[PDB]
Amino acid sequence: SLNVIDLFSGVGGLSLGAARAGFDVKMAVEIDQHAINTHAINFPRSLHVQEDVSLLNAEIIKGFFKNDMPIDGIIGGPPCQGFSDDSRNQLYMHFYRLVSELQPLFFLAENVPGIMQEKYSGIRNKAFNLVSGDYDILDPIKVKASDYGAPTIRTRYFFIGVKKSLKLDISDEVFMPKMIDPVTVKDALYGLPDIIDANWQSDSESWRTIKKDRKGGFYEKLWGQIPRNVGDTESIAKLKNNIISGCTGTLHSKIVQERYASLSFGETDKISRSTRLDPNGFCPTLVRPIHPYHPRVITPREAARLQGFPDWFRFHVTKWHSFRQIGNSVSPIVAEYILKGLYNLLNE
Numbered sequence: 532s533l534n535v536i537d538l539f540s541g542v543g544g545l546s547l548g549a550a551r552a553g554f555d556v557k558m559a560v561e562i563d564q565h566a567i568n569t570h571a572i573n574f575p576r577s578l579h580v581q582e583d584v585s586l587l588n589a590e591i592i593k594g595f596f597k598n599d600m601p602i603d604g605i606i607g608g609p610p611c612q613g614f615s616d617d618s619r620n621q622l623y624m625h626f627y628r629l630v631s632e633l634q635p636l637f638f639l640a641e642n643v644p645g646i647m648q649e650k651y652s653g654i655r656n657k658a659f660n661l662v663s664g665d666y667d668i669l670d671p672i673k674v675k676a677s678d679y680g681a682p683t684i685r686t687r688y689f690f691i692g693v694k695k696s697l698k699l700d701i702s703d704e705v706f707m708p709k710m711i712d713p714v715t716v717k718d719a720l721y722g723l724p725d726i727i728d729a730n731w732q733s734d735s736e737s738w739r740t741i742k743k744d745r746k747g748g749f750y751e752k753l754w755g756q757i758p759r760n761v762g763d764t765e766s767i768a769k770l771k772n773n774i775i776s777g778c779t780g781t782l783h784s785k786i787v788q789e790r791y792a793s794l795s796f797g798e799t800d801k802i803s804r805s806t807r808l809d810p811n812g813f814c815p816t817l818v819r820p821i822h823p824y825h826p827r828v829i830t831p832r833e834a835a836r837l838q839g840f841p842d843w844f845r846f847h848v849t850k851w852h853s854f855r856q857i858g859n860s861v862s863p864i865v866a867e868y869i870l871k872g873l874y875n876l877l878n879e
């Protein structure tokens with residue numbers, strides 16, 4: 532048992548990566564009620580703390596556990612003002628304060644582009660300082676998700692540190708993708724219903740039968756590889772009957788529909804700014820993409836697939852919330868790869 536806490540967890544993209552890599556995600560901390568409720572649905576055995584990280588310290592956190600829990604890793608997404616304001620920069624520093632106070636074997640922070648700007652070099656240096664005494668801090672890892680077999684080209688920075696006391700040697704071999712087959716839009720969307728319930732914002736789950744008669748790495752991750760103690764029981768049970776949630780469409784006017792039908796692959800609609808997916812391409816950074824074949828925006832479940840979430844992962848019922856939950860996540864496929872490198876290091 533190597534134990535992690537996920538700070539700023541959202542619905543648990545990075546958590547699922549950790550769990551699949553072999554870590555036990557013991558606690559998730561997330562301020563947003565919808566995000567953390569969704570995290571609890573998918574990770575019912577993790578502790579859930581709906582809290583501002585600024586109100587936390589090492590002693591408070593040990594108090595939550597009550598059992599002198601060894602915190603082997605602190606992972607998370609520290610917020611940053613980025614391309615946007617001030618409180619996010621405070622929260623950034625609290626992530627690193629917590630790492631310093633808790634002294635885990637490692638930390639992993641993920642950030643979107645915006646973090647490397649000159650105007651943040653002060654707070655990044657201040658954060659490096661809190662940890663550089665006790666940690667071997669790796670240079671930034673900038674990854675493109677599609678290189679790890681996720682169907683999207685979104686880029687992400689990972690910042691990793693490992694306790695000096697461990698005296699580990701870290702080559703990039705461990706984090707680099709090897710033996711990875713690319714997953715295009717067409718492959719990720721295979722077997723989903725062609726006819727879906729197109730509504731406005733309905734309050735009920737859109738459970739639908741899919742075809743699951745495919746083979747290969749992506750599909751094993753899509754329909755299985757459920758870590759121990761992870762997963763919504765009903766979602767898992769329904770998946771056994773080829774039934775999954777989130778297949779809910781949006782009702783479009785005929786004029787919109789005709790405009791979308793006329794889009795070529797990769798074309799951005801001049802009016803809505805939505806872009807039609809290329810079936811042999813990847814999903815751009817997650818306005819909603821237009822389906823490659825159907826004249827409509829994609830469904831939450833389609834977005835989930837394109838982001839690298841498995842079909843058994845359950846999101847909020849509404850399109851509004853689920854699309855935000857999906858867009859705000861690290862791809863679980865990318866997260867798993869990077870975190871498995873760290874797990875392997877800590878088992879030598």
Ligand SMILES: [Cl-]
Nearest residue numbers: 687861862865
């Ligand atoms: Cl990602």
